[PDB]
Design a binder for this molecule. Structure first.
Ligand SMILES: O=P(O)(O)O[C@H]1[C@@H](OP(=O)(O)O)[C@@H](OP(=O)(O)O)[C@@H](OP(=O)(O)O)[C@@H](OP(=O)(O)O)[C@H]1OP(=O)(O)O
Ligand SMILES: CCC[C@H](C(=O)O)c1c[nH]c2ccccc12
Lengths: 90, 567
């Protein structure tokens, strides 16, 4: 376990290169980037859920703000999608 | 990164939030569409099967709505539209893994059902809320073929009753039933079949019977279904006999998990008490079909402290509702229906005082649907004062254009108070003597309102104008016999793009003005529904019978009957 108690959780496993020291600590104390890597389905389900909450019910702009995504939409595409979204699917 | 994003995304299940994520970047738009499970299509002429099938390839669940709501007031002639086949045909080849189809006000044929039945293997949920054009033959097919069915729900649908035999076509291996609503059927289903059915389905939580199941047979069904959460009785009348009463009582209290009760057709007051075991845990009760008198209802209701929803005839009366008001501190939604609407002189003593009571007495009343014969601004003012938390308010005064009966004034300040005080009012529906002033009120205050309905109200286009101009959240407006026409509509035409539809029927909208709107607004679909021949056989300036405007991204539809005209 680098950089058999309750260490079989990870099905990437049951000697690590794509993890660090301060990270491994937090996993055993019990990122997502990881939680994945390793397969620990309940921790993947921990983070992915509360993350999905940073999102729940915020504007597209409001999300990419409070994340860090560059809007890569030509206003052409951005307006036509919003039209479909709102006229057909909401 | 793709996989983690897919996992985050599966938690987000709200349409508004799905759309929101589809619009955060080209990549989110792509992950998002591929793992979208459900599509809500509120107006099926708004977009095309094909457009949908390609945006959302892996869809498990489809809900679609057809004719607008004023089809319930028999105001959308047969032929208008609604056709679902095209939807089935398209999804049939594209949506192998489709699990549910919930449809509202659509035309559905035996053909469609056949097709659902043979194309969809994981099929599990069919809800047909007020549909037409299939028969029990249609149902047979589903019973026969859908190995995996969990819900068959036919709320106020209008079926062709070819025979009760459809239900036996369900094979003996079938066990997965969770929910059966067959209240609209008249076809008497085979009782043996139904019984064997209820018995081999351990997961069946909702069973809603038709009138053809007699009170006498109910007890037997419940012994087989002790785990029921929702029951709709069949008939509720019989010769009065305590073997009968007792078998009821026993069977019923054997259902510890019952929360919801309805049905009760021709209910005999002597047989209601059987249901008291239940009463103390009920959250929903629907007594709409029961013409039981007030004291009875009262006797029933003091038993029901946990009651959250109540639908009832006006037989309840004010005395009725004063009790309700002290008894059910948990009431969320009340619907009082009329027992005899084609009589302007009371048969019950249901007045405004009724609704006023409930409103002081139920901290949590938020939905209302109430038919009386008389009303006052004093009452509406108080109502609005007590229930700032109100969210759907539909009043309906039997005799139209009726004024406040104490002062004689129109009800504008009445309804003005509702919309001023119920800052989250998202639905409103109106009656009595009303002048453009109410609309000015709505336009100033109803900022969150989504749905408005109006009949015999208003003075001039100045009214529709205030609504179109004021109501930021408006999604659906629908109007009949009001003095509203061309000025308001054209003045406000782009509002129409931020709205799902406008219904105006028996109003003053001229064919000319329809023509012009259609021109200004390609992306709308301005349908004129009229049955007295072509609208050029008449001077441009003549009112059409009905016009139905709605945004769409699919352009004009192809299935217009012959009394329908796109502009
Ligand atoms: O328009 P209605 O024929 O009245 O029927 C309903 C409904 O009203 P019911 O309460 O009578 O079912 C809901 O509206 P609310 O009472 O909750 O306001 C509803 O579905 P929701 O449960 O999603 O609200 C929906 O409205 P929508 O699709 O606008 O949300 C819809 O009106 P439709 O005739 O548009 O289906
Ligand atoms: C009370 C009956 C239900 C209906 C509604 O609330 O949408 C309605 C109530 N009041 C109305 C006046 C005009 C058109 C529809 C209505």
């Amino acid at each position: 376990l680098k950089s058999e108690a309750v260490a079989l959780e990870s099905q990437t496993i049951a000697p690590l290169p794509n993890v660090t020291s301060k990270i491994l600590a937090k996993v055993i104390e019990y990122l997502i980037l990881a939680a994945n890597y390793l397969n620990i389905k309940n921790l993947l389900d921990l983070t992915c859920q509360t993350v999905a909450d940073m999102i729940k019910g915020k504007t597209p702009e409001e999300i990419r703000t409070t994340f860090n995504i560059k809007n890569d939409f030509t206003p052409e595409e951005e307006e036509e999608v919003r039209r479909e979204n709102q006229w057909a699917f909401e | 990164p793709e996989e983690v994003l897919e996992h985050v995304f599966s938690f987000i299940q709200l349409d508004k939030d799905r759309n929101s994520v589809s619009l955060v970047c080209k990549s989110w738009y792509e992950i998002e569409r591929w793992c979208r499970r459900k599509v809500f299509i509120g107006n099926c002429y708004a977009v095309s099967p094909a457009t949908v099938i390609r945006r959302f390839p892996k869809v498990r669940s489809v809900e679609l709505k057809g004719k607008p709501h004023f089809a319930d007031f028999n105001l959308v002639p047969d032929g208008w539209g609604g056709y679902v086949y095209p939807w089935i045909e398209a999804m049939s080849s594209s949506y192998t893994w489709l699990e549910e189809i919930r449809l509202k006000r659509m035309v559905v044929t035996d053909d469609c059902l056949e097709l659902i039945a043979k194309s969809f293997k994981n099929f599990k949920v069919l809800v047909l809320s007020s549909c037409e054009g299939f028969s029990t033959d249609g149902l047979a097919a589903i019973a026969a073929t859908c190995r995996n069915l969990k819900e068959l729900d036919l709320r106020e649908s209008d079926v062709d009753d070819v025979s009760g035999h459809w239900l036996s076509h369900f094979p003996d291996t079938y066990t997965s039933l969770v929910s059966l609503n067959i209240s609209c059927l008249a076809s008497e289903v085979s009782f043996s079949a139904l019984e064997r059915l209820v018995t081999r389905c351990p997961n069946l939580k909702s069973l809603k019977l038709n009138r053809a199941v007699p009170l006498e047979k109910l007890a037997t069904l419940l012994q087989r279904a002790p785990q029921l959460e929702e029951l709709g009785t069949g008939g509720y009348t019989a010769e009065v006999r305590p073997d009968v009463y007792s078998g009821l009582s026993v069977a019923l209290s054997g259902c510890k998990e019952l929360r919801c009760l309805s049905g009760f057709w021709d209910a005999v007051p002597a047989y209601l008490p059987a249901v008291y075991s239940v009463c103390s845990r009920l959250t929903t009760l629907n007594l709409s079909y029961a013409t039981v008198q007030s004291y009875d209802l009262v006797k029933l209701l003091c038993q029901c402290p946990k009651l959250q929803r109540l639908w009832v005839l006006d037989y309840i009366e004010d005395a009725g509702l004063e009790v309700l008001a002290s008894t059910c501190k948990d009431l969320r939604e009340l619907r009082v229906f009329p027992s005899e609407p084609f009589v302007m002189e009371p048969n019950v003593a249901l007045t405004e005082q009724g609704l006023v009571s409930v409103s002081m007495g139920c901290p949590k009343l938020e939905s209302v649907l109430y038919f009386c014969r008389q009303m006052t601004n004093a009452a509406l003012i108080t109502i609005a004062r007590n229930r700032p938390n109100m969210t759907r308010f539909r009043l309906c005064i039997i005799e139209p254009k009726a004024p406040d009966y104490l002062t004689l004034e129109p009800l504008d300040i009445g309804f003005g108070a509702i919309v001023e005080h119920c800052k989250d009012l998202r639905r409103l529906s109106l009656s009595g003597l009303l002048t453009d002033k109410v609309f000015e009120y709505i336009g100033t205050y109803a900022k969150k309102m989504e749905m408005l309905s109006v009949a015999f109200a208003g003075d001039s286009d100045l009214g529709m104008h205030h609504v179109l101009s004021g109501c930021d959240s408006l999604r659906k407006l629908e109007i009949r016999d009001c003095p509203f026409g061309d000025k308001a509509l054209l003045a406000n035409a782009s509002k129409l793009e931020t709205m799902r539809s406008l219904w105006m029927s028996s109003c003053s909208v001229s064919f000319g003005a329809c023509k012009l709107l259609g021109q200004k607004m390609p992306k709308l679909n301005v349908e004129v529904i009229d049955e007295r021949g072509a609208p050029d056989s008449r001077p441009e300036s003549c009112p059409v019978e009905r016009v139905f405007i709605y945004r769409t991204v699919a352009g004009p539809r192809f299935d217009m009957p012959g009394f329908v005209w796109n502009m």
